[PDB]
């Protein structure tokens, strides 16, 4: 395919986020590379406005599912690459149990040879001493299954999953993700049969990075269709 072909090798990534959580404003820039052959994403982010006012792990899902590895028998179900290079809009609402919610709108598209994820994020109704604004999340991440169905209406897909954030007191805080992706271009896209992405992530720190930052590794593989 055409969209497929843009991802046969390593692709550089840029990420830019403008955020407002409970009126608390911030900006993040990140960069790295994706290799959809392995399903691998590696990214580093800094908060360019000072200290991030929310925990880094709450922004992992917001910070490029076109880098998922789709097995060959599933390649006709890969909406994300099929919209490329024109790209897609990715919108979410993320509900933090008994706390506030994020609403995000991103454009994911090629700018030159670089895959760019440009995000606007608005967060409201957070408890000022909740787990999020109180910074009670552990700096880590777990594995999740990302459920994808076509939304033929909108020529795109609808996606839902629940993230498990570990809290420092031993408990777990769920973030209910509702997501829609719609193509930016006018070319045809692949509308998939129901399937899911198996995602796994690991967060770390660059011991030499003086700014508030996050290093993210994601591994993502599609599954749920047989043969």
């Amino acid at each position, epitope marked *: 395919s055409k969209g497929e072909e843009l991802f046969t090798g390593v692709v550089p990534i*840029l990420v830019e986020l403008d955020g407002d959580v409970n009126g608390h404003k911030f900006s993040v*820039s*990140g*960069e790295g590379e994706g290799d959809a052959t392995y399903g691998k994403l590696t990214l*580093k982010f*800094i908060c*360019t406005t000072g200290k991030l006012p929310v925990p880094w792990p709450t922004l992992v899902t917001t910070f490029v599912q076109c880098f998922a590895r789709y097995p060959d028998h599933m390649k006709q179900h890969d909406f994300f690459k099929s919209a490329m290079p024109e790209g897609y809009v990715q919108e979410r609402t993320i509900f933090f149990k008994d706390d506030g919610n994020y609403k995000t709108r991103a454009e994911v598209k090629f700018e*030159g*040879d670089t895959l760019v994820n440009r995000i606007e994020l608005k967060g409201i109704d957070f408890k000022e001493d909740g787990n999020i604004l109180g910074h009670k999340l552990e700096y880590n991440y777990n594995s999740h299954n990302v459920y994808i169905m076509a939304d033929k209406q909108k020529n795109g897909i609808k996606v839902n999953f629940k993230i498990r954030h570990n809290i420092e007191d031993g408990s777990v805080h769920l973030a209910d993700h509702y997501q829609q992706n719609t193509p930016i271009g006018d070319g045809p896209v692949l509308l998939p049969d129901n399937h899911y992405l198996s995602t796994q992530s690991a967060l770390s720190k*660059d011991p*030499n*990075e*003086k*700014r508030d*930052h996050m290093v993210l590794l994601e591994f993502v593989t599609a599954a749920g269709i047989t043969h």
Partner: nanobody
Amino acid sequence: SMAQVQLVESGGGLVQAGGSLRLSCAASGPTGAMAWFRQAPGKEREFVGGISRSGTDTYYVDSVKGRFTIDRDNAKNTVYLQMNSLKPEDTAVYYCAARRSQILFTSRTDYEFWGQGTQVTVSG
């Protein structure tokens, strides 16, 4: 899109504690974030301050905040470091550094291009 460049440092020199010195650096072509590192004798190269491609993001380590200033000229492909109220502990070999990406990361490992190092000596 950004390419291989060479960095040519000028300025610096010898000064008495409390004085001022200016460093400058000229890239052979356009580049992204630019920064200054320093290596004091028998210590590791360390980040001093830097500036994003656009100039709207700068960052300084705490020990120089308020005394050092950086700015850049994307028309001339240069950057400078104006160092005021210098202290003997500011003595070091200073390196200009750059990267293709616009983003002002601060780890040595994030920088692809390097000047050869310019001596700054502050006499107590």
